Amino acid sequence: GWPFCSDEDWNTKCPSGCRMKGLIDEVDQDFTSRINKLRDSLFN
Amino acid sequence: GWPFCSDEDWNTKCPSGCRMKGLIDEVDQDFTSRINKLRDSLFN
Amino acid sequence: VATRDNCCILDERFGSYCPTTCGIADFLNNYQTSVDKDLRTLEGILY
Amino acid sequence: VATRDNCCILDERFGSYCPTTCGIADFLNNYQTSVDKDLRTLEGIL
Amino acid sequence: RKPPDADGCLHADPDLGVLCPTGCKLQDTLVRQERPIRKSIEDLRNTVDSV
Amino acid sequence: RKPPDADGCLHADPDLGVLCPTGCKLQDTLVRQERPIRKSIEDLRNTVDSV
């Protein structure tokens, strides 16, 4: 049960690399999906 | 449920900073205790 | 490359240097917000 | 002056750099092994 | 949805625990991903116009 | 013994989870500890060798 971070902690304490890759993957999946849906709509 | 690392993963994937801080502190406590014991035997 | 002149905390015994995951999170926020705006523009046009 | 958590900016879009925890772990392993050997020798003297 | 975690692996030495992508690996991933996404958005804009 | 963890904190945004010391903070810790430790060991060697 870690305590909550202070605002000042950013850049001295940072997220897990596994959490970041998870977030990065989610964003890339969202963008890839949206680009594909746009292409599917060029001729409806 | 993570898989086991391969030899090629090191340098690309690394330990948690919270775990390294824990390990660093444990090593310092061990060495400090051992040095103090040697001092007690030589000057005490 | 990190040097004494461009990296005030450099101690090379600790190996090569990389962005921190805070830098990664801040980059991701800038990138995500920017790209999302452009996608919203296209979504308004084609839908 | 720059603060010590922001004085190694090597890419303007990714911020200030730090060693990885693999570098930290490898440095710690060498340091701990070296110091432990020296302490063992001292602790073995009667 | 639940905060996602990806690409971790267990080191042979339990004391080191789960290893995760470094800032350099994550940066490489982002730079590699940004290029095709931005290009695709530019091209898509033009295709809208060439239709 | 269960591997020790230290200095983590929970970020206000749950998506970011637990934050841990960066390589820079960990480096500072080791650089500062190594000096008195190595000097203390040299001091002990000298007291011993002086006999």
Side-chain angles (χ1 to χ4, degrees):
Chain A
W2 304 105
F4 289 109
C5 308
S6 162
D7 53 297
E8 303 296 357
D9 281 332
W10 195 250
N11 290 317
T12 44
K13 295 193 192 302
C14 298
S16 163
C18 288
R19 173 53 52 77
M20 294 317 301
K21 182 52 152 59
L23 294 168
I24 286 168
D25 281 352
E26 174 171 61
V27 165
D28 191 66
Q29 191 293 315
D30 181 57
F31 291 166
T32 293
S33 175
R34 289 165 72 186
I35 289 172
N36 280 327
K37 288 178 180 161
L38 287 160
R39 289 179 178 168
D40 286 340
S41 301
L42 288 166
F43 288 109
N44 191 291
Chain B
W2 303 114
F4 291 94
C5 307
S6 69
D7 322 307
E8 169 259 335
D9 285 320
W10 192 249
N11 286 163
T12 297
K13 293 184 185 186
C14 303
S16 166
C18 288
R19 174 58 57 72
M20 297 315 303
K21 183 52 161 54
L23 294 170
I24 286 166
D25 284 346
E26 175 179 58
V27 163
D28 194 62
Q29 195 70 190
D30 175 62
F31 287 163
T32 296
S33 172
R34 289 167 71 184
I35 288 168
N36 288 335
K37 183 180 176 187
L38 282 161
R39 287 169 174 179
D40 289 344
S41 80
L42 298 167
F43 307 95
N44 185 283
Chain C
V1 203
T3 65
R4 175 204 307 178
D5 280 359
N6 66 22
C7 189
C8 98
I9 69 313
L10 177 67
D11 186 330
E12 79 186 334
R13 295 180 295 162
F14 293 83
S16 68
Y17 283 26
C18 295
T20 61
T21 49
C22 287
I24 294 306
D26 290 332
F27 176 99
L28 181 61
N29 177 254
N30 289 323
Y31 168 63
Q32 197 283 150
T33 294
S34 185
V35 172
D36 175 69
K37 296 186 192 176
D38 286 338
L39 288 174
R40 289 194 190 205
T41 295
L42 285 296
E43 293 170 330
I45 292 170
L46 293 309
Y47 304 155
Chain D
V1 81
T3 55
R4 285 180 79 263
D5 61 350
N6 196 46
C7 75
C8 191
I9 298 172
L10 307 183
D11 186 309
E12 61 181 59
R13 304 198 302 160
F14 284 93
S16 199
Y17 286 35
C18 296
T20 70
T21 46
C22 285
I24 298 298
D26 286 342
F27 181 96
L28 178 61
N29 177 269
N30 178 84
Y31 164 70
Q32 196 286 153
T33 294
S34 174
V35 171
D36 175 69
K37 174 195 168 189
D38 286 344
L39 285 169
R40 179 191 312 177
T41 297
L42 288 163
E43 295 165 333
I45 292 173
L46 304 192
Chain E
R1 189 218 64 174
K2 313 307 173 182
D5 291 313
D7 294 5
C9 67
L10 303 185
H11 190 293
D13 180 350
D15 271 10
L16 295 175
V18 184
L19 305 194
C20 296
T22 64
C24 283
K25 180 57 174 59
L26 297 162
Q27 167 180 51
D28 284 350
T29 289
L30 283 159
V31 166
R32 175 180 62 61
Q33 287 174 166
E34 180 185 29
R35 273 224 296 77
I37 291 298
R38 294 281 199 190
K39 181 179 76 171
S40 296
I41 291 175
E42 300 187 307
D43 288 344
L44 197 36
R45 293 181 176 190
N46 298 329
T47 296
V48 172
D49 296 343
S50 67
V51 159
Chain F
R1 68 92 183 62
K2 288 185 179 180
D5 285 312
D7 295 357
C9 65
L10 305 181
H11 192 279
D13 179 343
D15 265 6
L16 295 180
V18 176
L19 308 189
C20 293
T22 61
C24 292
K25 290 295 291 193
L26 296 163
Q27 181 186 102
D28 282 345
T29 298
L30 278 164
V31 166
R32 295 193 65 215
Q33 295 172 332
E34 171 179 43
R35 297 172 190 158
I37 289 280
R38 300 278 201 181
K39 181 50 171 288
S40 291
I41 287 174
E42 287 313 298
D43 289 342
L44 289 168
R45 288 189 169 199
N46 295 328
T47 68
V48 166
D49 292 323
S50 293
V51 187

